[PDB]
RNA sequence: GCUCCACACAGAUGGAUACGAAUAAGGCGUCCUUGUGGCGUCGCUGAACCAUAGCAGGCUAGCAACGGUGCACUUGGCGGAAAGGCCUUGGGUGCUUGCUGGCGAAUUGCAAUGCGUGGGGAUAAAUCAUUUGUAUACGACUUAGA
RNA sequence: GCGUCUACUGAU
RNA sequence: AGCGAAACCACAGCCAAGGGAACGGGCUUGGCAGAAUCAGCGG
RNA sequence: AAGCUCGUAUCAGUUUUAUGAGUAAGAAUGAAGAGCUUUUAGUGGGCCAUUUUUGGUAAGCAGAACUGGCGAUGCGGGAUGAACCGAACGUAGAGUUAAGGUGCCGGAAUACACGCUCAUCAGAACAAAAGGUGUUAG
RNA sequence: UUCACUGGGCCAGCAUCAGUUUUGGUGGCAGGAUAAAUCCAUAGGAAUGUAGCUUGCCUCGGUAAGUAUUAUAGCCUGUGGGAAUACUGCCAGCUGGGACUGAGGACUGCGACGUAAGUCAAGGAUGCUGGCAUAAUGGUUAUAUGCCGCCCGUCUUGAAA
């Protein structure tokens, strides 16, 4: 229904996040993926790391370069992942993998819209309480990722540039809210209360 | 005044097909709403309708208009097939498609 | 589902002997035809007598006379593995003595990695008295006005999206 | 909804009512009759004559296999 | 702070034929199996899975391994089922229930209402 | 691009509807005891909120109103991550279905959805050409001249 | 780790 | 400056794995990378 | 291929019984298309698996009795294939299956219930005798 | 020449029909231990011991140890009373919805209804209507979309080479 859906990176999954947002990117909706620097990864942290550098050994012999490149932004390793979940080698493909677009954190103007989350795909729904798990934030530094301070210390703008927004709006609504307490009990509101409104 | 639309909305996912083979002849619509093949029961029969916008201006509104009935359910995700009598060119996977709520029966 | 039928044995009555040694015994199977199947084979094992000059005379269904009471079944079984086969015994606290089979297959299956197959249901009777029970995680719902929570609960939409995140609390 | 009808006559609209071969006048003064005494009937309901007057339509999250006629 | 399950536990049953209807715990079979039982809510006494019940924030007395008769008449003596009413549940349930049985004629009273109160609501703010 | 001459025209159908953050805890109000606080309450899915009535949505009269809102200016701040949007301040300009009336819908007849080109006048400069070496197997590149 | 017809090595 | 062949040519080429006698070059799974275009390690 | 009397008990990769260390059925089942004379093209091969083996050593193996597929064999599936599973074939419209599948590439439920396991590359023909103060149950 | 009626071919919508097929609602039957449940009564048993009472104790005169089998809750066993209901199978039961086929071509027959007359869903679509001659509609060509497709014939091939 929504001609945009964005989808918060944290507390997600991002082998199930990928899998479902293939489908419906497939389907002509179009999903921009935010905070791709929070995606969660099950297992150890340790674990993880493993098998990302497993495939150096094996980029090429005659030619390196000529080869799988080593891709350590998060928004775009994650968008790898969701890469090989669609047939990218054919011409819808190529069209439906367009329409996804991830950036780290949530930059203008996808900060004045409200965004939304997969219930299917939230690791605090499906990881048993305890276990170890990666946040992927250290992860694509520990690989080379230099851009996560900066990261970190403009997130903390945003979310102090946004507080204040809330508030201004929970003031605003106070008065709706006392407007339609001290309306109620009318001739005109108690119909709408019988009819289920 | 604001809103005019009628006709349910819903999406083309592909055709019926196999791992290898295919058949344009049977094509599989998503409807909004539909969460199970019993909700799907209502929606079979129900004439369905694609438009897009053409280059030629054939009889003055460059729109046009394929028209088609829905079948049978489909899986459990409440998908239903559907058939028209013109196929569609394949190339609409994903795209936006009208089902009308004629003929009606409640 | 599963189900109890009661079975017996007659074997063909030779010349001067009808009716010999009664063999009655109980199966539990789903179906009919699976607890035949069932007697024909625990027969061929605790005794000699085969299939071809047995013959079964009635099979009766026999449900529970109070299927609205929990009771700590007692339940003791012998199967075979990759090993010798060797008896065990085990106790189950279920309303109903099908329902107590099941969760006893379920569990051979989970833990023992067993089948219908290779395990045989000896006998089934139910506990009529506290701290019999030897197994302490059956033991352990005895205690007096038990009460606990369920942490972190698990929920499920029709919808593929949401825009509050829920908590698990419950 | 149901309005009463039977205070309307409404066997002259027969089959062969309608032909072809610029408003013909009895049509127009069939169809007054019919309105005007309808509009009794419609007077009794209150906003039924703004609801018919009302144009149909749908809105976004509707659900027509859970909407109830 | 969590809810409990226990003897006397009253639930509400999430699928089944007997979903939208009150049960009250009878006595906890193991951690995924329990038993109710829902007399006055027509529920057939039978055990259930913790998973196809959801646990409602409202309790009464009941002994451990109370019949029917027990059951139903902890239940009248409690009142569990005005207690039901005034919680939020009966009241969401009330008006998903309603609005999914409007009328079209219904229905645009209630749009005709809604306007008139955001009217009202509307000259009642910012004077 | 200033300008003249001359011709050519991957899927819109109400609204991406903005706090942070745990998931063995988290919001709203009360209430200062402003502390890791007391009280009522929320979830248990968005099955929600706003919005939606008028020939593809007209003309016209009255009441309450002075509220709601499309339109350009207007006092100004924020937004630099892909800033490209928010409003308020003031009148003006239309409507108001909040309420009460008058004018007409037909014949369409039982559905076939109903912004660039090829030629000039003025401006901008870069290769061509010469020179140069700081470059140089040969391309390429770097200096200088109305 | 350092000790003991696929390809471009200079190019448009 | 100008003249002016021949050998050969079913068609021909970005790679890793499977492909049975392994021939992989046209089958499958993944990763590459520019119309056009000099020049070669002592392959 | 041509001719005959035939139509049946001619018979049958089937089964049972009075009766072996098949005899007969005034038997069970099924095909109405069975024999006799004259001759007409083509045919002297193996591979894979099995009931037998000639014996098991790290290991050579040739010789050879038997039944199924390929041979001459499409199509669906095991993503990838001769030794696998179903299925053998007039062009077509309508619905249900088998193998094989239901997160995506892939058309199909991120279905229900039991517990099991965090692998420093778990999981989706062999070293398999042991070790763990690893875990779940007797 | 006054007129009145009427008209070829394309595909469709509508009502009811025959065949195939898919999925709902609902009623009536036979069996289980003449379902087992649940409920009522009856004689007994017990604690994970209901109340009362006793014994000592702080957050208060109530906190864990007893007698205690229903008391200021209830549970189980056997018996009697009575219905209900899951499951299975049946109805030559009723009632909708979704998809395709229209094939044959004046009566010879098998059947039902109806007193007869006649009718019918009874050995294959009947009737109304929509749109059109600058038509309706159809074909061809070059890309595009999803899938499939290893280059031809021969020859030693067990075959593959």
């Known amino acids: 229904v929504e001609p945009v859906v964005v989808i918060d990176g944290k507390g997600h999954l991002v082998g199930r996040l990928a899998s479902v947002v293939a489908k419906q990117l497939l389907n002509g909706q179009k999903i921009v993926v935010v905070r791709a620097e929070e995606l969660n990864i099950s297992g150890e942290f340790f674990r993880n790391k493993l098998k990302y550098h497993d495939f150096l050994r094996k980029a090429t012999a005659f030619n390196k370069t000529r080869g799988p490149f080593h891709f350590r932004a998060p928004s775009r390793i994650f968008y790898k992942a969701l890469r090989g979940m669609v047939s990218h080698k054919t011409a819808r493909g190529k069209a439906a993998l367009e329409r996804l677009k991830v950036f780290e954190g949530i930059p203008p103007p996808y900060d004045k819209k409200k965004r939304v ?46 507080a204040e927004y809330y508030a201004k709006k929970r003031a605003f609504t106070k008065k709706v809210a006392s407007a339609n307490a001290t309306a109620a009990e009318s001739d005109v509101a108690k119909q709408l209360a019988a009819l289920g409104y | 005044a604001e809103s005019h639309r009628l006709y349910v909305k819903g999406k083309h996912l592909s055709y019926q097909r196999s791992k290898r083979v295919n058949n344009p002849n049977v094509s599989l619509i998503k409807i909004e709403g539909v969460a199970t093949p019993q909700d799907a029961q209502f929606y079979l029969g129900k004439r369905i309708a694609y438009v897009y916008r053409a280059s030629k201006e054939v009889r003055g509104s460059k729109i046009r208009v394929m028209w088609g009935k829905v079948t049978r359910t489909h899986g459990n995700s409440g998908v239903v097939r559907a058939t028209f009598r013109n196929n569609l060119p394949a190339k609409t996977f994903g795209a936006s498609v009208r089902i009308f709520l004629y003929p009606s029966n409640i | 589902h599963f189900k109890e039928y009661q079975v017996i044995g007659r074997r063909l009555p030779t010349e001067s002997v009808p009716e010999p040694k009664l063999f009655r015994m109980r199966i539990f199977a789903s179906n009919e035809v699976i607890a ?67 969760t006893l297959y379920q569990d051979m299956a989970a833990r023992h990695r067993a089948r219908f197959r290779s395990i045989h249901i000896l006998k089934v009777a139910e506990i009529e008295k506290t701290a019999d029970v030897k197994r302490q995680y059956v033991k352990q719902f005895l205690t007096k006005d038990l009460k606990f929570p369920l942490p972190h609960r698990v929920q499920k939409s029709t919808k593929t999206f949401s825009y509050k995140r829920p908590s698990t609390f419950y | ?58 809105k976004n999250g509707d659900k027509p296999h859970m909407l109830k006629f | 702070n969590w809810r409990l399950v226990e003897v006397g536990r009253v639930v509400l049953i999430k699928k089944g034929q007997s979903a939208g209807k009150l049960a009250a715990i009878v006595e906890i079979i193991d951690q995924k199996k329990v038993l109710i039982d829902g007399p006055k809510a027509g529920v057939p006494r039978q055990a ?80």
């Open chain 1, 117 to 162: 989350v997969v219930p299917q795909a939230l690791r605090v729904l499906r990881l048993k309480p305890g276990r170890k798990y990666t946040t992927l934030g250290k992860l694509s530094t520990s690989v080379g990722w230099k851009y996560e301070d900066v990261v970190a210390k403009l997130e903390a703008k945003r979310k102090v540039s946004s």
């Open chain 3, 36 to 102: 035949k199947s069932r007697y024909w084979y625990f027969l061929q094992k605790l005794h000699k007598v085969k299939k071809a000059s047995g013959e079964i005379v009635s099979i009766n269904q026999i449900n529970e006379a109070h299927p609205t009471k929990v009771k700590n079944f007692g339940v003791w079984v012998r199967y075979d593995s990759r090993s010798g086969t060797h008896n065990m015994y085990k106790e189950i606290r279920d309303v109903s003595r099908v329902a107590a089979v099941e």
């Open chain 4, 1 to 58: 909804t149901k309005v009463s009808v039977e205070g309307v006559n409404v066997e002259k609209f027969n089959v062969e009512y309608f032909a072809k071969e610029e408003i013909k006048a009895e049509r127009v003064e069939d169809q007054k009759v019919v309105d005007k005494a309808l509009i009794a009937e419609i007077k009794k309901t209150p906003l039924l004559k703004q609801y018919l007057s009302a144009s149909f339509s749908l």
């Open chain 5, 48 to 127: 259930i899975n913790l998973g196809q019940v959801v646990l409602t924030p409202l309790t009464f007395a009941l002994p451990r391994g109370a019949r029917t008769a027990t059951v139903s008449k902890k239940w009248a003596a409690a009142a569990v089922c005005e207690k039901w009413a005034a919680s939020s549940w009966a009241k969401k349930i009330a008006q998903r229930e309603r609005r999914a049985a409007l009328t079209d004629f219904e229905r645009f009273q209630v749009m005709v209402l809604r306007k008139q109160k955001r009217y009202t609501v509307k000259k009642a703010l910012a004077k």
